[PDB]
Write an enzyme that holds these catalytic residues in place. Structure first.
Site, PDB file in Angstrom:
ATOM      1  N   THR A 173      47.487  63.394  26.176  1.00 29.52           N
ATOM      2  CA  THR A 173      46.350  64.026  26.818  1.00 29.52           C
ATOM      3  C   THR A 173      45.100  63.177  26.640  1.00 29.52           C
ATOM      4  O   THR A 173      45.023  62.292  25.780  1.00 29.52           O
ATOM      5  CB  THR A 173      46.055  65.403  26.228  1.00 29.52           C
ATOM      6  OG1 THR A 173      45.358  65.239  24.979  1.00 29.52           O
ATOM      7  CG2 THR A 173      47.324  66.206  26.035  1.00 29.52           C
ATOM      8  N   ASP A 174      44.090  63.491  27.442  1.00 30.78           N
ATOM      9  CA  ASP A 174      42.759  62.962  27.208  1.00 30.78           C
ATOM     10  C   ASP A 174      42.144  63.711  26.028  1.00 30.78           C
ATOM     11  O   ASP A 174      42.751  64.616  25.443  1.00 30.78           O
ATOM     12  CB  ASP A 174      41.918  63.075  28.481  1.00 30.78           C
ATOM     13  CG  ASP A 174      40.763  62.067  28.546  1.00 30.78           C
ATOM     14  OD1 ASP A 174      40.050  61.855  27.555  1.00 30.78           O
ATOM     15  OD2 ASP A 174      40.541  61.514  29.624  1.00 30.78           O
ATOM     16  N   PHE A 175      40.926  63.324  25.674  1.00 32.47           N
ATOM     17  CA  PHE A 175      40.289  63.820  24.465  1.00 32.47           C
ATOM     18  C   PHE A 175      40.118  65.324  24.550  1.00 32.47           C
ATOM     19  O   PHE A 175      39.419  65.816  25.441  1.00 32.47           O
ATOM     20  CB  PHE A 175      38.939  63.122  24.285  1.00 32.47           C
ATOM     21  CG  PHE A 175      38.285  63.392  22.976  1.00 32.47           C
ATOM     22  CD1 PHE A 175      37.531  64.541  22.784  1.00 32.47           C
ATOM     23  CD2 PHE A 175      38.398  62.489  21.936  1.00 32.47           C
ATOM     24  CE1 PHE A 175      36.921  64.785  21.571  1.00 32.47           C
ATOM     25  CE2 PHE A 175      37.786  62.730  20.711  1.00 32.47           C
ATOM     26  CZ  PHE A 175      37.049  63.873  20.535  1.00 32.47           C
ATOM     27  N   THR A 176      40.782  66.054  23.647  1.00 37.33           N
ATOM     28  CA  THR A 176      40.704  67.515  23.597  1.00 37.33           C
ATOM     29  C   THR A 176      41.248  68.143  24.901  1.00 37.33           C
ATOM     30  O   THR A 176      40.956  69.290  25.254  1.00 37.33           O
ATOM     31  CB  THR A 176      39.250  67.910  23.222  1.00 37.33           C
ATOM     32  OG1 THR A 176      39.129  67.895  21.789  1.00 37.33           O
ATOM     33  CG2 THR A 176      38.781  69.258  23.704  1.00 37.33           C
ATOM     34  N   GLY A 177      42.117  67.411  25.608  1.00 39.99           N
ATOM     35  CA  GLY A 177      42.559  67.868  26.917  1.00 39.99           C
ATOM     36  C   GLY A 177      43.224  69.228  26.869  1.00 39.99           C
ATOM     37  O   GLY A 177      43.067  70.051  27.787  1.00 39.99           O
TER      38      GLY A 177
END
Ligand SMILES: [Mg+2]
Ligand SMILES: [Mg+2]
Lengths: 733, 733
Positions: A254-258
């Site tokens: 995932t992306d950051f904190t996705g």
């Protein structure tokens, strides 16, 4: 075989909690070591320094029960310490070997400092210059986008698909942002995305597929929703497309904190959305702790199978195996390498070289009837503007390992390189924008211009005093680097107010003016194109930008870059792009304005600068096209060749572009598609043939049922120096 | 219900193939079509004006064609025949379904009286792009509001009992347009590409067409735009799967103007090929293209169209005529005494003035200087100067799409006010400025008989003249904004501001120190941040129709208390498009008061908010809402009730609006969606109760699988005076 049996035995020794822990990717932030000891960290991002990375790695090797090594990630986007142009500028080189070599260098520098995994290349197609992250990408076109995705992953990982990641200077690449993140509605970062399946595949998806085809080790899921489902919870995209149809074999992060941001999205709580992502095909969880926090309970309750978890775990393990990290956890932890490998002269020579082959000359009229550019190496040249003497704004956005305060500004670098030849003076001229609070948020992450309390008239007067002492003005104007990048959307794409006012005052001196334009996006420049003698788009050049700009302005390098994103006339034209449908009421050539056609009341349909546009100090001349046949059945392929002649006074390079038009479709087809290109160098006077092989594959497209097919019928084959200047010939299949 | 079928079977079994194809032919009027009609090759005519002319032509189809099949006579009667009601977009702002159904009743009464049996209306295209000129013809951005007006309009045209329609000689067949999605044209440019998901179509864009079908609409008009890469006229998924199989539509589908032939320019084939595809898709009648008469029989002979398919299309044309009573009485609409009786009577104009007054939106009414009172309502005394290029033009009062209107016969703003305010207010005039600086732009903006008679005068002269009137007046009515033809079909703008010279004229008027009421004419949302800050009073008068001047006086001088509320968001700038009230939350939403926050979904140079939200509109009085009483906390039904009290000094109407938010979905749901409304009238100090019934059906939406479902879980029920200021309570399903 070897890998499979080795991961088999490892996974046999692993508890369910340890398998979940392999899926966990936090920031390094004494703290993290406790997670590692408990076996809860699959990898780490944003830790910097080879010596610290080794120390963290020794903890995983010696103090976790099982001794599984860690992955170490970072956004190595266009350089580690040697900083290349921002990707969007780099794409304007159209030079696939230079682009691969820029990734090769970034891999060598970041690997010297213990990084084995980069969140790069970014390959989102974008038709909306309002989005600041267009700077991280490759422009609006999926064919060029695909080739560049290929150059970056092959530069990072190695060229041979079956022999990547086996050197200690080859690192795992991560293609992002799967998917359609560039169509955030209304140009606002993170906003809703919506489009048909056909548009996706025919226009948006290919550059991701190119990265997977090139061997990319990882994929990042995007922040945006697709079809009402956040990408991080979309089984169709993460399984059916990514695995079932495309054959991806690495892992999804995932992306950051996705994961936890899906709660905001509106689709449920942390347990619910973490399980959906894991079941969707998401393997690694960046910072959210959704997997660590809830997978074991979801498995308890039958919402996730042990099978599902074991797949995701194995992919993490497989990546670590392919990187060589079970063989040697410290493959990338050579404390000796950073002195040998980081910010060397050979790295800096190649970055400066490619920077000056990435700039785009948009205008070169007279200001004496010589073209303004290149400049004589004599006299006094003043560099005036907010961008003329700022070091930190040279690398561009997304250069998180750069040494912002160390690289030369335009004023500095020119003064040095032209020592003994040109008298280089300076004036700030104007602030960045009259709104101080805007200038501040536009200059965060260390990019301050140290804004004064001087009136606009004080700096205006000082700049005119200095300009009267000069023979030529280099107006260094445009954006700060952080006016683009992540969470940097603009509703207005003009040159900022105080800068344009400064610009006109400089034009009122009657002295030659060269606009050296810094930007991460297309800007709206109809006034500059009409009034400014010479305009060079330098994007953001990287750590060597000042010298490259000196190379180009003083003719040591003849500019050869060409736009990879369209430059509209105003913001109301968005989206404006070269590969559009014809519509049923096209405005025919020259007919603006015509009632009951598809056009506007207050501006014509044309961009200011089309896709592929780029001037040179020299001119190029094209022959008509020679086809080796008029039909495809004759040999199963055909060849389209032209001869290009350098008819001007300068040795120069030219990007020859191949466009194709499928005239009749079972669905509407674009009026042209980039299907090939070739950047050639020509001595002044010499000519060369440029051939393109047309294959039935080159003519395919996803029809209405999403079958990838070529339909019989007519095509127009075009070749030229941009999507508006082409010779045409005619083929049928 | 079988009398019709037996009759049409008997007629069809007498028809040659050619005559069946003839019925499918819809040419314009121009033996102006008398050669074609005699050979049985015309199913109807459009844009023939004149009951006697229509009666003569129709006598040709009865007496000179072999079979005597009568004609249908169509016209774009959109918001009036000769009594002109406000343009639909301004009309939608009344939120008064009963008054809206009466506006179509009047238009139908006038149109039938003059021989027209068939109107191309209502236009129910949802749009969120105010660049598109055709938002003037629609109902705003919301599908629940748009669907109610669809029903109001079709009931107005055809009759209220869907089982008892078109039986009267003052009821005419309506045509819902443009199916489908024509309001999502890319970059807001008319006829341009449309692309979106199937999910967005049905949750956001599609319901107004279905509402019209459910309202009994007799016919449906295919749009110009492509959809999933297939032009709507060839789209069989659309015209057959959705329109008939799913929605149960029983009438017939007609093309827009030369829709079939423009599919050649779309790029999907030659005239025979696209003509076959459209008839195979469910298109029944061919407007002007001549594609059905030119190729259908050839395609049947070649086996590309079945007879059964031709008989289907022919039967629906014949059923249309039967349902109109035309076989039984071919002259039902041909009463040469009816024009004087039914057209442009005092009664009709009274109703136009009433609804116009009740549709203008009061955008701003701040008090200024030392005034105890707001500028509006104006006092019936002294001298009031009407100033601006919209102050003294009769022809621009109707608005766009008034094809039957009498452009010279309707009073301009300065004339209407002058005569209605005789003996109370001294009403004077000055032109003040041209419509816009570029004269070539003004002539395109005022075509179709809308010329303002642009002089040879300089901007200064006209300014000096206006300011010399102004200095003798007590109040100034700045009659500014768009000409009528700056909106409508093929009238897109990439700039949504007040035109340059009008802005200049307004600034000079503001500088007089005298009170200034901006009376804004327009067919679309404009960008008005500067006006919202600097003009004390702003009333959006859209275009009010034939009685606009009289209704502008009603409101400005107090006899009518403005009650209009916006149906389409006004953004602060073009860079925010699309901006609309019913968007998704995203995963990084910017919270209230937080602009600007890095790494939220927001812009660098403007906040996320519209200048004026959906449902916004002020009054001369204040309305206060009690908290919401819900008859039960969980879902028979449940009842949502507020008390509204007029706490101010004047009688007035108030649009109460109901919003619902589905908190968690299996896909992301909008942050709110209009689910009800109610326009109440309160004497000063009076209180009334407003109650809505919340059923599961009202909570249904299309999920990922396009199943229409209400999902158990939590809901926010909201009631308020606009979409941004609401009382909140909580319902669980
Ligand atoms: Mg074709
Ligand atoms: Mg729900």
């Amino acid at each position: 075989q070897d890998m499979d049996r080795f991961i088999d035995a490892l996974m046999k020794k692993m508890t369910v909690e340890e398998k979940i822990g392999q899926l966990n990717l936090p920031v390094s932030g004494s703290d993290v070591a406790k997670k590692i000891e408990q076996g809860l960290v699959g990898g780490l991002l944003n830790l910097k320094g080879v010596e610290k990375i080794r120390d963290v790695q020794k903890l995983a090797i010696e103090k976790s029960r099982l001794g599984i090594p860690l992955i170490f990630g970072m956004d190595v986007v266009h350089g580690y310490e040697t900083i290349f142009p921002i990707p969007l500028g780099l794409s304007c080189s159209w030079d696939m070997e230079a682009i691969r070599k820029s990734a090769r260098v970034a891999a060598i520098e970041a690997s010297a400092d213990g990084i084995s995994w980069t969140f790069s290349p970014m390959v989102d197609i974008s038709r909306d210059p309002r989005w600041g992250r267009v700077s991280e990408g490759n422009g609006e076109d999926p064919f060029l986008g695909g080739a560049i995705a290929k150059a970056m992953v092959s530069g990072y990982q190695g060229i041979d698909l079956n022999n990547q990641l086996k050197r200690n200077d080859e690192i795992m690449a991560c293609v992002k942002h799967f998917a359609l993140y560039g169509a955030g509605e209304a140009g606002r970062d993170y906003n809703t995305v919506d489009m048909s399946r056909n548009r996706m595949f025919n226009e948006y998806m290919y550059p991701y597929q190119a990265a997977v085809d090139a061997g990319v080790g990882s994929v990042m899921a995007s922040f945006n929703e697709i079809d009402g489902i956040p990408a991080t919870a979309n089984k169709w995209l993460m399984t059916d497309v990514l695995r079932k149809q495309w054959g991806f074999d690495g892992f999804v992060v995932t992306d950051f904190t996705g994961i936890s941001e899906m709660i905001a999205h509106g689709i449920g709580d942390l347990q619910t959305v973490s399980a959906r992502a894991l079941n969707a095909g998401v393997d690694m969880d960046m910072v959210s702790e959704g997997f660590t926090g809830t997978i074991k309970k979801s498995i308890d309750e039958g919402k996730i199978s042990m099978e599902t978890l074991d797949k995701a775990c194995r992919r993490i393990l497989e990546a670590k195996y392919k990187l060589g990290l079970f063989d040697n956890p410290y493959k990338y932890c050579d404390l000796k390498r950073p002195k040998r490998d980081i910010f060397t002269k050979e790295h800096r020579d190649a970055a400066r070289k490619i920077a000056g082959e990435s700039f785009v000359l948009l205008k070169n009229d007279k200001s004496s009837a010589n073209p303004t550019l290149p400049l004589k190496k004599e006299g006094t040249v003043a560099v005036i503007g907010p961008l003329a003497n700022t070091r930190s704004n040279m690398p561009g956005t997304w250069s998180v390992a750069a040494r912002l305060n160390d690289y030369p500004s335009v004023y500095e670098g020119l003064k040095e390189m032209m020592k003994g030849k040109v008298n280089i003076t300076y004036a700030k001229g104007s602030n960045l924008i009259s709104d101080a609070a805007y200038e501040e948020r536009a200059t965060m992450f260390g990019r301050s211009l140290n804004r004064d309390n001087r009136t606009d008239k004080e700096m205006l007067d000082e700049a005119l005093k200095v300009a009267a002492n000069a023979d030529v003005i280099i107006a260094a104007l445009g954006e700060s680097s952080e006016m683009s990048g992540e969470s940097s959307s603009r509703t207005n794409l003009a040159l900022p107010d105080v800068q344009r006012t400064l610009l006109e005052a400089l034009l009122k001196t009657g002295k030659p003016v060269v606009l050296t334009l810094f930007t991460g996006r297309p800007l709206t420049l109809t006034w500059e194109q009409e009034h400014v003698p010479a305009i060079l788009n330098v994007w953001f050049g990287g750590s060597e930008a000042a010298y490259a700009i000196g190379d180009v302005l003083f003719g040591d390098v003849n500019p050869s870059g060409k736009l990879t994103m369209t430059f509209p006339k105003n913001v109301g034209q968005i989206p404006l792009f070269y590969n559009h449908k014809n519509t049923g009421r096209p405005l025919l050539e020259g007919k603006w304005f015509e009632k009951f056609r598809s056009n506007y009341l207050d501006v014509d349909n044309d961009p200011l600068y089309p896709f592929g546009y780029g001037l040179s100090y020299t001119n190029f001349q094209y022959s008509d096209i020679t086809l080796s046949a008029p039909t495809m059945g004759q040999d199963g392929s055909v060849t389209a060749m032209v001869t290009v002649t350098n008819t001007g006074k300068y040795d120069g390079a030219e990007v020859v572009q191949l466009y194709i038009r499928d005239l009749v479709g079972s669905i509407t087809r674009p009026v042209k598609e980039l299907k090939g290109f070739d950047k050639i160098f020509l001595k002044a006077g010499e000519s060369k043939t440029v051939s393109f092989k047309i294959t039935p594959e080159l003519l395919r497209f996803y029809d209405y049922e999403l079958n990838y097919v070529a339909e019989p019928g007519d095509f127009d084959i075009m070749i030229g120096g941009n999507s508006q200047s082409v010779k045409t010939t005619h083929l049928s299949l």
